[PDB]
Design a binder for this molecule. Structure first.
Ligand SMILES: *[B-](O)(O)[C@@H](C)NC(=O)c1c(F)cccc1F
Ligand SMILES: *[B-](O)(O)[C@@H](C)NC(=O)c1c(F)cccc1F
Ligand SMILES: [Cl-]
Ligand SMILES: [Cl-]
Ligand SMILES: [Cl-]
Ligand SMILES: [Cl-]
Ligand SMILES: [Cl-]
Ligand SMILES: [Cl-]
Ligand SMILES: [Cl-]
Ligand SMILES: [Cl-]
Ligand SMILES: [Cl-]
Ligand SMILES: [Cl-]
Ligand SMILES: [Cl-]
Ligand SMILES: [Cl-]
Ligand SMILES: [Cl-]
Ligand SMILES: [Cl-]
Ligand SMILES: [Cl-]
Ligand SMILES: [Cl-]
Ligand SMILES: [Cl-]
Ligand SMILES: [Cl-]
Ligand SMILES: [Cl-]
Ligand SMILES: [Cl-]
Ligand SMILES: [Cl-]
Ligand SMILES: [Cl-]
Ligand SMILES: [Cl-]
Ligand SMILES: [Cl-]
Ligand SMILES: [Cl-]
Ligand SMILES: [Cl-]
Ligand SMILES: [Cl-]
Ligand code: NA
Ligand code: NA
Lengths: 471, 471
């Protein structure tokens, strides 16, 4: 008899009608397929043959059914159970008057990539689609820390207080870049761009990456994302990207773990009855962002939750368990164009928890499904996890790496004090200031005219005009 | 033996070391004083004599100590107990790193004025000051629905979508009218003024009341407020006003009960051992605001909580008890100038709950004490009350009175479409629109130049300029 086990050896089942069974069985069959094909000396060339693939997939399945294999998962029994009870008890809180709302969640150890528990859906018995591991949806604005701002910072093209343009602007086709029914405002710090999840600042950031020839694909692929076309305007808003929750959880794991990626996994070992190791997870850690970059981003995402602008999460959690709400949470929300998908990604230094909600047919959620319902659900979910394993979230704080450089910049320009040229009259540029965190060697540049990320000639006119009137 | 009883006859004590005992004993002694002086045929003239007052106060005290009087309070035993356990368990949630934070609360039946339970402080054993009944503090922005907007509406001087100026302006002494460290913005609806609790719009509103000779003192005194000087610029921000929580609770009771005041009371009856009724609460209901006015205000204060701008309350409550959070809550927050006092006033159609926090020495709280800590505490408190008396909050909805008049106005001007004069060029005034609720007979006026409440000639220039550019 083959058994699937929790991470401490306790048996999950013999080879039973929920997500856990089918998800861990599927992954194991995949690992068995690879072992068996290698064992039988099947070249990767012969492995291309579709009749051969089919035979080896069935072999792997039967090999488990019949054999005496021990399959060690990463799953934590108390944690995963709590997470199931949570979704059964509180999942109704997702329903926002747009029909039954589906959900997927993945809880991941930041230092290993191991998956400690997950939520595949509202109720396997009614809908078997696995929303943690199978369904792919746009990650929307949760793309921005990874693909736009994180890389800009890591490339030394901006720092924690750099200014960006949220002035009105169009896609190449001439259409307005929208954020909800807003069409934009004026300049703003990275903090505000992130806390509000504005779109124009993300657009301009990714334009600057393109203009500088930055290898964005390299960052993304190091974390296991497959994106077919990087040449998309709305890429940093999640356009052209579809991800599972497990995959996307792994990106935020990278940020949380000070820039070091660990590949997600639910299977840790497969052994034959006699001990022969058939499969074993091999950890391959990769420094995707510099320690400076990640710790600076950690500090921005702390205020994304604190500010409470796009999510009620900290309020919800404070009420349920104020001691847990005092742990060091950082996070980012996301919303697709027709309120089709909502994400909330949460981390402590120890764990990351990814969450998505939506409909299987892709129809719209209510305007507040992400801001409110999913934040509240996730608060309950995080509470449930803590009560099942009191120390699992940890009490450690995120902190800036020593390698972080700190420059005093002007609040107004996000840049160092200096002279600068505004039609005629070149200005001494005074005003109040702040400490900006950079991930390069020199830190903030001297102030120059085109001070923001992005913006039109009109834009800089209005801005400097408003700025100078303030001297 | 004299007894003090809960509202169902259950005995509280014989004439024991908490707020309940001392508060109900004090009020009873006051009612005994009046009975005894009348009994002894002591004229109100002789009652002016201070030696005579002193004797009759001691007589009333001893008369209770010795006699066989039955004192019936309004207090609900389960409710009041739950409220004590709540403050003992969750009161620490008020502490915001500015020292120990004090608290007072009063729960009132909207249809009777009866006080069902209250919180006098963190812990009688450590500090005996009664913060529900004795301490008087400025009610700050919770003054605005009562004294500025409510009366403007009731006088037919504005409606639910009327525009007001939050443009920069000074007090007569030349100082900027501040809202936090902001000095103001542009025009805005009553909704936004209330949701954000901006100051300038309240200033201009109370100026308009003064300009029109409105009897403001008449509204306020009908609800039992004593305000010595109505000639104060910041009156609608709570300047020149100090109130107990019980008194201020009674004002919001008036709004909640569709404009009908019922005098607050904690004693309902005092009887001698033989049955002689010595004192009995006589209900004297008063229509302070029209039904139109109150129901229109109810609808504004629903969105003050919904919007979550000045209080996390609905988020906190949603997590603790989502079914209770679906009841029909309306409310208003307040903050004094140096973050010295925070208030949250909450109502369902059935109950009102007033809350204050602060320090006995008047020193500053943290910036977020009101927005966050007190909202969370109050959420727990409201939950505790529901669990002790499951139906007490009720499931009824606030609704507009039939007498409410409804006019289509321009979103931009808060006023009806028409022609109007802007230097030269008198405009046909187009644009998108909304339904505005008024409490007069004719509803919204035709649009005119000075369309807002308040504003300078500069102000209207910028506004109309921005408005016209939008046609
Ligand atoms: B992001 O998911 O916060 C960002 C791309 N989302 C939006 O722009 C957005 C909203 F803010 C609101 C509704 C839909 C939508 F795509
Ligand atoms: B009101 O209490 O909301 C209003 C009068 N309060 C304030 O203007 C205010 C703040 F908004 C913030 C800090 C102090 C203060 F008086
Ligand atoms: Cl499961
Ligand atoms: Cl599955
Ligand atoms: Cl075989
Ligand atoms: Cl386990
Ligand atoms: Cl690329
Ligand atoms: Cl992917
Ligand atoms: Cl490309
Ligand atoms: Cl795996
Ligand atoms: Cl074997
Ligand atoms: Cl590094
Ligand atoms: Cl917070
Ligand atoms: Cl569906
Ligand atoms: Cl450098
Ligand atoms: Cl008490
Ligand atoms: Cl007392
Ligand atoms: Cl006597
Ligand atoms: Cl009772
Ligand atoms: Cl008056
Ligand atoms: Cl008073
Ligand atoms: Cl006066
Ligand atoms: Cl009384
Ligand atoms: Cl008697
Ligand atoms: Cl009436
Ligand atoms: Cl709400
Ligand atoms: Cl909130
Ligand atoms: Cl004090
Ligand atoms: Cl009229
Ligand atoms: Na979002
Ligand atoms: Na306030």
């Amino acid at each position: 008899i083959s058994e699937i086990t929790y991470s401490d050896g306790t048996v999950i089942a013999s080879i039973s009608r929920d997500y856990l069974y089918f998800t861990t069985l599927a992954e194991a069959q995949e690992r068995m397929y690879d072992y068996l094909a290698q064992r039988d000396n099947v070249s990767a060339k012969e492995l291309k043959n579709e009749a051969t693939q089919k035979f080896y997939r069935d072999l792997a399945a039967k090999e488990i059914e019949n054999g005496g294999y021990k399959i060690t998962t990463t799953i934590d029994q108390k944690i995963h159970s709590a997470m199931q009870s949570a979704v059964a008890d509180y999942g109704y809180l997702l329903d926002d008057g747009t029909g039954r709302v589906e959900v997927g969640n993945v809880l991941m150890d930041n230092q290993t990539g191991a998956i400690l528990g997950f939520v595949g859906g509202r109720n396997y018995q009614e809908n078997q689609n696995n929303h943690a591991f199978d369904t792919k949806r746009s990650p929307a604005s949760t793309t921005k820390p990874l693909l736009a701002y994180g890389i800009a910072i890591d490339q030394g093209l901006m720092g924690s207080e750099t200014i960006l343009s949220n002035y009105p602007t169009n896609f190449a086709n001439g259409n307005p870049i929208m954020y909800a029914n807003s069409k934009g405002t004026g300049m703003m710090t990275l903090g505000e761009a992130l806390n509000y999840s504005w779109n124009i600042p993300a657009y301009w950031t990714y334009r600057m990456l393109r203009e500088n020839g930055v290898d964005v694909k390299g960052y993304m692929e190091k974390m296991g994302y497959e994106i077919p076309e990087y040449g998309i305007e709305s890429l940093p808003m999640g356009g052209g990207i579809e991800v599972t929750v497990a995959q996307h959880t792994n990106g935020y794991q990278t940020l949380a773990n000070n820039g070091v990626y660990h590949q997600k996994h639910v299977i840790s070992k497969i052994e034959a009855a006699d001990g022969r190791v058939v499969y074993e997870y091999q950890d391959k850690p990769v420094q995707v962002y510099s320690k400076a970059t990640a710790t600076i981003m950690q500090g921005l995402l702390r205020e994304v939750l604190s500010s409470r602008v796009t999510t009620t999460f900290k309020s919800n959690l404070t009420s349920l368990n104020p001691t847990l709400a005092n742990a060091d949470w950082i996070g980012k929300t996301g919303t697709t164009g027709q309120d089709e998908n909502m994400w909330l990604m949460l981390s402590t230094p120890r764990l990351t928890l990814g969450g998505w909600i939506g409909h299987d047919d892709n129809h719209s959620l209510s305007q507040q499904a992400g801001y409110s319902n999913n934040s509240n659900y996730m608060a309950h979910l995080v509470n449930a996890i803590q009560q099942a394993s009191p120390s699992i979230w940890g009490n450690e704080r995120f902190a800036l790496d020593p390698s972080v450089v700190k420059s005093e910049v002007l609040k107004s320009t996000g840049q160092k004090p200096g002279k600068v040229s505004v039609e005629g009259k070149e200005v001494e540029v005074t005003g109040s200031t702040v400490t900006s965190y950079w991930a390069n060697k020199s830190g903030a540049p001297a102030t120059s005219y085109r001070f923001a990320i992005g913006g039109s000639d009109a834009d800089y006119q209005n801005a400097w005009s408003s700025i100078v009137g303030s001297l």
